[PDB]
mmCIF file of C-alpha atoms in Angstrom:
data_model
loop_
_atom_site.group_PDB
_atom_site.id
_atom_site.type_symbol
_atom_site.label_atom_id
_atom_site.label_comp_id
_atom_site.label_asym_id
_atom_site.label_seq_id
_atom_site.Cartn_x
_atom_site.Cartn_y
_atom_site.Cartn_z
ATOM 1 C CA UNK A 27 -18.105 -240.362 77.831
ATOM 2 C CA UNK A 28 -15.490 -237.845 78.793
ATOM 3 C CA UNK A 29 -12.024 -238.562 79.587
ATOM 4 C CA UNK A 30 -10.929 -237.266 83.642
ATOM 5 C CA UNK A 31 -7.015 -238.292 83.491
ATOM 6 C CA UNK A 32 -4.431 -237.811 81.312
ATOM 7 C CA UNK A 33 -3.152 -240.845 79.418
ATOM 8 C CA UNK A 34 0.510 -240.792 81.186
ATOM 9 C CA UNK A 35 -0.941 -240.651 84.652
ATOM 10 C CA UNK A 36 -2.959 -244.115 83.894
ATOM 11 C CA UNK A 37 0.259 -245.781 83.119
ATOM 12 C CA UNK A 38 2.057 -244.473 85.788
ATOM 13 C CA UNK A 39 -0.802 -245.695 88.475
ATOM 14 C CA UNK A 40 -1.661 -248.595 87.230
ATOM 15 C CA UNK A 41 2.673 -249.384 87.117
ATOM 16 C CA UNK A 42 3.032 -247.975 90.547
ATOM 17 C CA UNK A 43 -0.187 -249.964 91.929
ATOM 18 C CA UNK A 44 0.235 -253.655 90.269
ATOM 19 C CA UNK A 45 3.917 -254.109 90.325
ATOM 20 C CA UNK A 46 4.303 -254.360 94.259
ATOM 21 C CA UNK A 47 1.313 -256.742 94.288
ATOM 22 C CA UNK A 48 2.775 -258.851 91.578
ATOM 23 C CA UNK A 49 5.955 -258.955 93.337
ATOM 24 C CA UNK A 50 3.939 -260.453 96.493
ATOM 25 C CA UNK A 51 2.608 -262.638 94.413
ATOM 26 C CA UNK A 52 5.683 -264.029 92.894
ATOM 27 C CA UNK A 53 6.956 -264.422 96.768
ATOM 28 C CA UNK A 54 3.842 -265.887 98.335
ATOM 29 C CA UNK A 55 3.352 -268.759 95.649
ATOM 30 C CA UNK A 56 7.208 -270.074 96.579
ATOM 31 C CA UNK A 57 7.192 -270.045 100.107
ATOM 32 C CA UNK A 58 3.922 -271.714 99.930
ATOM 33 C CA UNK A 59 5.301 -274.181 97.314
ATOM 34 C CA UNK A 60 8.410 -274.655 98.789
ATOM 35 C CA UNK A 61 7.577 -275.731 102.560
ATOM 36 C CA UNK A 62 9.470 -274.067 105.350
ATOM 37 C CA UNK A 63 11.158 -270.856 103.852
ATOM 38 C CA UNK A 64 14.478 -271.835 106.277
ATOM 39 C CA UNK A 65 16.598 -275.463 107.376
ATOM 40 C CA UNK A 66 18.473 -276.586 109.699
ATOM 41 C CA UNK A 67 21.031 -278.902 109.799
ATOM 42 C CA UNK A 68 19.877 -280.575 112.960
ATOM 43 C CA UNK A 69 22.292 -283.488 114.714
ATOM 44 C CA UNK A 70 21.489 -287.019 113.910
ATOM 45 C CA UNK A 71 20.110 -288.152 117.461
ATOM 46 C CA UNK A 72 17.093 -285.773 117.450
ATOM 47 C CA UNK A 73 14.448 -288.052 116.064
ATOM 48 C CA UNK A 74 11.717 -285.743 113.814
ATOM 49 C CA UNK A 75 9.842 -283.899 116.164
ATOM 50 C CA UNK A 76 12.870 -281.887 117.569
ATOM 51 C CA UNK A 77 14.021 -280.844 114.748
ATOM 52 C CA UNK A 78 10.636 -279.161 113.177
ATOM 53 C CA UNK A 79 10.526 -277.464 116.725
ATOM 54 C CA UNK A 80 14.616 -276.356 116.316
ATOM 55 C CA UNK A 81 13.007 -275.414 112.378
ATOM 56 C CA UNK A 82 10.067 -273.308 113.718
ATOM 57 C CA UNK A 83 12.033 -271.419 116.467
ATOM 58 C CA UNK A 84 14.652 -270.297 114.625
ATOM 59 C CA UNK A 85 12.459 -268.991 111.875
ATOM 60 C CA UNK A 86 10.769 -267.484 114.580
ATOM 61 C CA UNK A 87 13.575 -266.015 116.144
ATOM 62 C CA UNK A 88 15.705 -265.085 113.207
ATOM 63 C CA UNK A 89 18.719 -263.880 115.078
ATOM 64 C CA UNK A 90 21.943 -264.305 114.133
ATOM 65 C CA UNK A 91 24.191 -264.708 117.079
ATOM 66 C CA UNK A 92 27.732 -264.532 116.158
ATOM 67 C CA UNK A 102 22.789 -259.275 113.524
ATOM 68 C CA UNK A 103 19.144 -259.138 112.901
ATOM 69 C CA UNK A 104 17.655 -260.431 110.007
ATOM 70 C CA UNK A 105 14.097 -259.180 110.632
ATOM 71 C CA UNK A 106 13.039 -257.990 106.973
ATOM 72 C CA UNK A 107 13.122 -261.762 105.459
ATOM 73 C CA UNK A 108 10.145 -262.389 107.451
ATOM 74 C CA UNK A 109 8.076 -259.529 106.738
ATOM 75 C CA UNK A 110 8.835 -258.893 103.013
ATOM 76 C CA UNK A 111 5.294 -259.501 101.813
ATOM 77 C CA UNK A 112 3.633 -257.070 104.306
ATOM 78 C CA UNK A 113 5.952 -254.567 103.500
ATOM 79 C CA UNK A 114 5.229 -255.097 99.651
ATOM 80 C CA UNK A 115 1.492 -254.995 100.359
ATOM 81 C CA UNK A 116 1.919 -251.376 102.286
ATOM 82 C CA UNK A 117 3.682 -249.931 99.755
ATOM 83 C CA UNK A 118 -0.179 -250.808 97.130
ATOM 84 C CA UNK A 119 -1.926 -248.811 99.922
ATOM 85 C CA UNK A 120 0.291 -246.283 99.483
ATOM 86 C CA UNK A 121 0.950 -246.110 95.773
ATOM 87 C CA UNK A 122 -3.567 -246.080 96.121
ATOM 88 C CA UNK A 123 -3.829 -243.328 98.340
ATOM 89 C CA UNK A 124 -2.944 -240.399 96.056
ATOM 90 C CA UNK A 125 -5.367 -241.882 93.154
ATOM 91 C CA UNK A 126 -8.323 -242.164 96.092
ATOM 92 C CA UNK A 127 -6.796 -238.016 96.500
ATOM 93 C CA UNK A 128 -7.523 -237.560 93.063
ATOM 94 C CA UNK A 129 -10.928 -239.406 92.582
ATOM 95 C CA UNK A 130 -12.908 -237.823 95.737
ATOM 96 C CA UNK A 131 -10.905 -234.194 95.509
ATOM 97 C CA UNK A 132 -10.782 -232.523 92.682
ATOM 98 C CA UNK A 133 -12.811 -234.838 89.763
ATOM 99 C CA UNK A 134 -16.272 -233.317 90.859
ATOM 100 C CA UNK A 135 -15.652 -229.729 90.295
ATOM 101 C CA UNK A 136 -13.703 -230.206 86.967
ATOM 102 C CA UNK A 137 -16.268 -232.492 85.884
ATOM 103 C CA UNK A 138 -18.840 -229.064 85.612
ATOM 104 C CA UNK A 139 -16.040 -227.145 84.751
ATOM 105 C CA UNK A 140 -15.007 -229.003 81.674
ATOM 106 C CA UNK A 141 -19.022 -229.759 81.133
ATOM 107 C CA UNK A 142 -19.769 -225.824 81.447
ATOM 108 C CA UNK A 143 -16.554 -224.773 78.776
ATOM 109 C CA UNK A 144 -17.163 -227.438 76.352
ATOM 110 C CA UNK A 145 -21.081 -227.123 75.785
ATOM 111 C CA UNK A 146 -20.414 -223.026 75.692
ATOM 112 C CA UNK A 147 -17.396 -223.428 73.694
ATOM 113 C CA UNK A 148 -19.435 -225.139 70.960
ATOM 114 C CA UNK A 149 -22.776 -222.416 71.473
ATOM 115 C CA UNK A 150 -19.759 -219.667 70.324
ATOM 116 C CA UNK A 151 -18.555 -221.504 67.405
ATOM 117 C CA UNK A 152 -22.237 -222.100 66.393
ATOM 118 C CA UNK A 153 -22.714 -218.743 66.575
ATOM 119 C CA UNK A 154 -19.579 -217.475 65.034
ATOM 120 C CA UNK A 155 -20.679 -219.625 61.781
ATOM 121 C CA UNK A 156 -23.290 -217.295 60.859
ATOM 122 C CA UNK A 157 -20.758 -214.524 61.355
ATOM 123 C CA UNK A 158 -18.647 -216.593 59.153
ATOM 124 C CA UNK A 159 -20.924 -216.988 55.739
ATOM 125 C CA UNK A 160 -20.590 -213.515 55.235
ATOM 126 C CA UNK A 183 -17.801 -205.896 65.500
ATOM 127 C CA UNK A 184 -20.737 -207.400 67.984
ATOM 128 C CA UNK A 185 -17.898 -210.171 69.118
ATOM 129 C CA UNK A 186 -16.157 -209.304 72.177
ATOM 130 C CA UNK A 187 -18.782 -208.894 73.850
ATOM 131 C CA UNK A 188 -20.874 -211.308 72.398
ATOM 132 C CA UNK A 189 -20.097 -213.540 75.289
ATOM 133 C CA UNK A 190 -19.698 -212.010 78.483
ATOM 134 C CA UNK A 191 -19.906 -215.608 80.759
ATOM 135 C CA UNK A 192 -17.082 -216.466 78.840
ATOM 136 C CA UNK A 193 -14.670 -213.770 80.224
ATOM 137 C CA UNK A 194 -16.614 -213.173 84.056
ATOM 138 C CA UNK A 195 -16.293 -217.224 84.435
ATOM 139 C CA UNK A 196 -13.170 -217.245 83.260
ATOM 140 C CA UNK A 197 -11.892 -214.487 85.475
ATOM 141 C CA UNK A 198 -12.899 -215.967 88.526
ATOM 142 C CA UNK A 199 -11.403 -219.085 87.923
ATOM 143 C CA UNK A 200 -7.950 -217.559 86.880
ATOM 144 C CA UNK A 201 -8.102 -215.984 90.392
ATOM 145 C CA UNK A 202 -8.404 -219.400 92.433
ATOM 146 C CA UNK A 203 -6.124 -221.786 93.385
ATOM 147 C CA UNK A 204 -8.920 -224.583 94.331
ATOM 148 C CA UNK A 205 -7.371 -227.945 92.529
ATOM 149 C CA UNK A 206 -4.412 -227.095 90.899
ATOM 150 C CA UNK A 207 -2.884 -227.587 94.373
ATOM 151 C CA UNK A 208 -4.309 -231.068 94.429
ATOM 152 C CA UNK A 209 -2.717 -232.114 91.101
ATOM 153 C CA UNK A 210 0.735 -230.766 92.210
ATOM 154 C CA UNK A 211 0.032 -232.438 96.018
ATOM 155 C CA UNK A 212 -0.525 -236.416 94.152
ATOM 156 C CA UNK A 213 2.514 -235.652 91.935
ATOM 157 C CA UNK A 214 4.411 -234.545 95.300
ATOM 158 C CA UNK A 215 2.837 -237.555 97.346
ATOM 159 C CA UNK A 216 4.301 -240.052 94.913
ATOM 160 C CA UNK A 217 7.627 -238.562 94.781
ATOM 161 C CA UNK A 218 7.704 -238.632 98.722
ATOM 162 C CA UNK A 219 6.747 -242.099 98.968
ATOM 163 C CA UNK A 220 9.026 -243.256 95.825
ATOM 164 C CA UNK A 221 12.041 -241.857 98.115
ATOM 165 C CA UNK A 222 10.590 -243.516 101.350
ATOM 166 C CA UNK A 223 10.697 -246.849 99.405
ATOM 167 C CA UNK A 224 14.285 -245.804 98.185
ATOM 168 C CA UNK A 225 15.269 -244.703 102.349
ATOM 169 C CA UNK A 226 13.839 -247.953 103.418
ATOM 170 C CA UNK A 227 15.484 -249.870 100.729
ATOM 171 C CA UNK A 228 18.848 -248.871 100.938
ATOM 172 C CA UNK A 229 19.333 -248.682 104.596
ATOM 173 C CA UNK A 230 17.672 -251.971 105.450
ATOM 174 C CA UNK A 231 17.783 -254.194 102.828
ATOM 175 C CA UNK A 232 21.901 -253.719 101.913
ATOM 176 C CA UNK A 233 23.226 -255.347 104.889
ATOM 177 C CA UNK A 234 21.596 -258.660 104.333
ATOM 178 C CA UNK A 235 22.639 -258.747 101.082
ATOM 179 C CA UNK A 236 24.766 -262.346 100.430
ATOM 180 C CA UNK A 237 24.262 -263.576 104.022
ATOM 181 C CA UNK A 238 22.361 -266.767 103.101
ATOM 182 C CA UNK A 239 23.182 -269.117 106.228
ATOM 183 C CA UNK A 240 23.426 -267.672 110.552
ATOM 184 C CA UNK A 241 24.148 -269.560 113.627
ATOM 185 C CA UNK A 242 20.670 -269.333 115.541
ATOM 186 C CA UNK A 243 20.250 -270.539 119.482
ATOM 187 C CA UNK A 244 17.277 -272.098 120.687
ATOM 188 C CA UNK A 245 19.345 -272.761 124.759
ATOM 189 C CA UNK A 246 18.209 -268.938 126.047
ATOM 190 C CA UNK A 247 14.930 -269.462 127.907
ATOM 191 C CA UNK A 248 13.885 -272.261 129.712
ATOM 192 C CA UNK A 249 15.419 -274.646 127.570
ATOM 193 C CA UNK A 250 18.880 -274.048 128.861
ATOM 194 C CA UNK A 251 20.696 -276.229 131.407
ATOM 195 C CA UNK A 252 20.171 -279.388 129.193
ATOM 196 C CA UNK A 253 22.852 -281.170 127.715
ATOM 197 C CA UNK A 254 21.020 -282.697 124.986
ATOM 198 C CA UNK A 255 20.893 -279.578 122.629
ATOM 199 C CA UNK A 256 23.841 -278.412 121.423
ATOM 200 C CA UNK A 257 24.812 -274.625 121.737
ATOM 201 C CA UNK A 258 24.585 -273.607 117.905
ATOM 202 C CA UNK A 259 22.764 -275.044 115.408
ATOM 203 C CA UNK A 260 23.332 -273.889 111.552
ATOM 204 C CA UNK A 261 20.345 -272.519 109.482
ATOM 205 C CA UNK A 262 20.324 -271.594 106.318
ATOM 206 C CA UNK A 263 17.886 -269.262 104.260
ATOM 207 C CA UNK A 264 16.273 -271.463 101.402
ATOM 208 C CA UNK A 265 14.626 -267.746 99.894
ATOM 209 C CA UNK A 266 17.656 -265.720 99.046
ATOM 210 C CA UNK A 267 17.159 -265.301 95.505
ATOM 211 C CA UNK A 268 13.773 -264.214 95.626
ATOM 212 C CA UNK A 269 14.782 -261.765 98.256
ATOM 213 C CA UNK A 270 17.497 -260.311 95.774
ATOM 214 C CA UNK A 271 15.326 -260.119 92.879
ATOM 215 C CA UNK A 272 12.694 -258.258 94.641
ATOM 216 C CA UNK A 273 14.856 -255.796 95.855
ATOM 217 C CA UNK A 274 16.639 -254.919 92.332
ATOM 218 C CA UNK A 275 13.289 -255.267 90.113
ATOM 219 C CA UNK A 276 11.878 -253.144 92.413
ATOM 220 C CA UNK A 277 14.596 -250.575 92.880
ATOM 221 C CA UNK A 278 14.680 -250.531 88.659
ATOM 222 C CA UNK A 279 11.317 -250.115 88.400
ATOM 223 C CA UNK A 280 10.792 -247.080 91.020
ATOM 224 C CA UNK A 281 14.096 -245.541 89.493
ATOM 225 C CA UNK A 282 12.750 -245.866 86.023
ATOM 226 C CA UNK A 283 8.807 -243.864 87.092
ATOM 227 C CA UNK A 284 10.422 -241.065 88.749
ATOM 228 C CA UNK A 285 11.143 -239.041 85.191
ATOM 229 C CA UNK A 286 7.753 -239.588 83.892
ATOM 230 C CA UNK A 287 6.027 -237.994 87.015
ATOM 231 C CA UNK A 288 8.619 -235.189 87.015
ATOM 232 C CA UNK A 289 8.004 -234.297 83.537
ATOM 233 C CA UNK A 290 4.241 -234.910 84.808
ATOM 234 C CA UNK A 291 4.250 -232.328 87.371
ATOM 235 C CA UNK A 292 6.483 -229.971 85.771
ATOM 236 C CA UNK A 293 4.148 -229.730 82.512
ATOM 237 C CA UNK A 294 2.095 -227.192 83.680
ATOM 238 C CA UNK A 295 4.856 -224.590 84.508
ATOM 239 C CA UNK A 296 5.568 -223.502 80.836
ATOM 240 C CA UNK A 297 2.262 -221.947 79.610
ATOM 241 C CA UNK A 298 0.319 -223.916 77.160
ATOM 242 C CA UNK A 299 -0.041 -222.778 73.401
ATOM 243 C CA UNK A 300 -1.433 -224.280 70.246
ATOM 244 C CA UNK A 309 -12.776 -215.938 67.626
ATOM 245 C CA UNK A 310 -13.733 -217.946 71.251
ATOM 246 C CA UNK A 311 -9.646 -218.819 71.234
ATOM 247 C CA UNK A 312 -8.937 -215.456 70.394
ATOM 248 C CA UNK A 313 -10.108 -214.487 73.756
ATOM 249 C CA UNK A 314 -8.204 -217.693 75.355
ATOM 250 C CA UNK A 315 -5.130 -215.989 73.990
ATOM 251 C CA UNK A 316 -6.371 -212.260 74.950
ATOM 252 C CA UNK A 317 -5.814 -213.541 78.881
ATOM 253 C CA UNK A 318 -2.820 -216.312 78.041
ATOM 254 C CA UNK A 319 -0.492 -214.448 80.506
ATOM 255 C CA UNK A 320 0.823 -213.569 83.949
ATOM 256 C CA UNK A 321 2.441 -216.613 86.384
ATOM 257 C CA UNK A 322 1.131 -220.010 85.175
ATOM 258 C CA UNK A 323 -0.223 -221.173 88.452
ATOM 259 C CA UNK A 324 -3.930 -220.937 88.214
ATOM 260 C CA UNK A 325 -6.607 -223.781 87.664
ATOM 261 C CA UNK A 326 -6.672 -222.280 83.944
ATOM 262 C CA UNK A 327 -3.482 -224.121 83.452
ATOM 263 C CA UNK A 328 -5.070 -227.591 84.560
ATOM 264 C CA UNK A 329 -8.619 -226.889 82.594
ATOM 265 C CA UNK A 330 -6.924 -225.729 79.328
ATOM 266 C CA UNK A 331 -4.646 -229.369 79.404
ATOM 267 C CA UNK A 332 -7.714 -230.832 79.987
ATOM 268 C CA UNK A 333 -9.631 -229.596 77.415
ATOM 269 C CA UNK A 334 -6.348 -230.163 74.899
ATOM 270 C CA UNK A 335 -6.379 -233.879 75.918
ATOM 271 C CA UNK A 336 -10.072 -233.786 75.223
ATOM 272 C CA UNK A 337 -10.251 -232.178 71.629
ATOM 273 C CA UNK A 338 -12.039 -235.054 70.023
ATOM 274 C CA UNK A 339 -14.950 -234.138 72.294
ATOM 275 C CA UNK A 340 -15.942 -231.277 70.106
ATOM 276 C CA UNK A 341 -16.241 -230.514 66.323
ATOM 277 C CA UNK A 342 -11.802 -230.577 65.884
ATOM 278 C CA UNK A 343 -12.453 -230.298 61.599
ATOM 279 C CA UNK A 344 -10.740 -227.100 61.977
ATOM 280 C CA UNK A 345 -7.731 -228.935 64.278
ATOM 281 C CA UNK A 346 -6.297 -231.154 61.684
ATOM 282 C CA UNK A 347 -5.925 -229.022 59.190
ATOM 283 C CA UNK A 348 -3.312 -226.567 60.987
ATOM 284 C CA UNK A 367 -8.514 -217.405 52.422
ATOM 285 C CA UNK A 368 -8.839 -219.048 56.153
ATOM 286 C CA UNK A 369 -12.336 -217.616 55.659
ATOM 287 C CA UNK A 370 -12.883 -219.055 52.752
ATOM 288 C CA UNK A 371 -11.345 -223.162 54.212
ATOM 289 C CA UNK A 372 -13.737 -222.240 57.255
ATOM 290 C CA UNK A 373 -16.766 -222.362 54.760
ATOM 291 C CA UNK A 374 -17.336 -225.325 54.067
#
């Protein structure tokens, strides 16, 4: 029953995973309701048929002659890449670095709790420093790595990258078609040319505007509004964590913070409830210990 992920890095994925699948949703069940997502204002002599051919081509086409209005039609696929990649770091996270720290936090907490049952007999009342040995060898060769603290910083970094891809793409495609609701499309290039019949220009007008709009700014609020949360996220570890076995926590609490000590000892704060925490909540001593 032990916890792997810190409570602010749930929110944030499951924000960053659902929202761009909820917006799909909310444009897939109009379209669908709506009929075609485009008209046409057609002339009067062109029966039915013609006109749900001058319909389909020009949604097909989406050119605007008199310039490209490309990202209408593939607004849900774009929305459904950016899940996969909101997914990816999580999928990172899940087959990188949970199996060691798993045995790691396993390993710390079971010995962590042999000390303090030791220590008690000491208590009732100096064979103590080195009255564990494992827990300053072990200890000392993790300090010396650098195995998965360089996978929590790389997620943290991943999402920032992609959260400013999604702000590139955004802003540089999405702004110029911003209030252009109606284009002049052409269906007399190809073959169909060199018939009178047809006029030259036929009106169309987007029928999906506003869900287009409101996409684009919930979306750009939302992604503005995660990016201080994972920030503060990934800039957590840098200042070193503070609150007989903690004595010699504190004896090596020094030296540049980035180690995998940094990530274990937040993990093992967000975990307290795991152990006996009677001492925790009630921040002489000896004599409170006792009972």
């Amino acid at each position: 029953g032990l916890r792997l992920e810190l409570p602010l890095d749930r929110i944030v994925k499951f924000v960053a995973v659902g929202s761009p699948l909820l917006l799909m949703s909310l444009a897939f069940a109009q379209e669908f309701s709506s009929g075609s997502p485009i008209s046409c204002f057609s002339p009067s002599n062109f029966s039915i048929r013609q006109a749900a051919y001058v319909d389909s081509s020009c949604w097909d086409s989406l050119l605007h002659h008199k310039k490209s209005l490309w990202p209408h039609k593939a607004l849900p696929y774009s929305l459904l890449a950016l899940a996969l990649l909101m997914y990816l770091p999580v999928l990172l996270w899940q087959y990188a670095a949970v199996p060691a720290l798993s045995s790691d936090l396993l390993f710390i907490i079971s010995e962590l709790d042999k000390s303090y049952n030791r220590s008690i007999r000491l208590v009732q009342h100096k064979e103590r420093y080195f009255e564990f040995p494992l827990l300053e060898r072990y200890l000392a060769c993790k300090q010396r790595s650098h195995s998965l603290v360089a996978t929590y910083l790389l997620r943290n970094s991943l999402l920032l990258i992609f959260t400013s891809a999604t702000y590139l793409y955004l802003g540089h495609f999405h702004l110029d078609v911003f209030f252009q609701e109606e284009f002049s499309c052409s269906i007399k290039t190809g073959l169909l040319s060199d018939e009178t019949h047809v006029p030259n220009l036929i009106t169309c007008r987007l029928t999906s505007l506003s869900i287009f709009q409101i996409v684009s700014l919930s979306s750009v609020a939302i992604y503005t509004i995660l990016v201080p949360v994972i920030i503060y996220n990934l800039t957590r570890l840098c200042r070193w964590d503070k609150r007989p076995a903690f004595d010699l926590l504190s004896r090596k609490m020094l030296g540049c913070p980035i180690n995998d000590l940094n990530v274990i000892l937040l993990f093992l704060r967000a975990n307290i409830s795991e152990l006996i925490s009677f001492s925790w909540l009630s921040v002489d001593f000896m004599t409170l210990l006792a009972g």
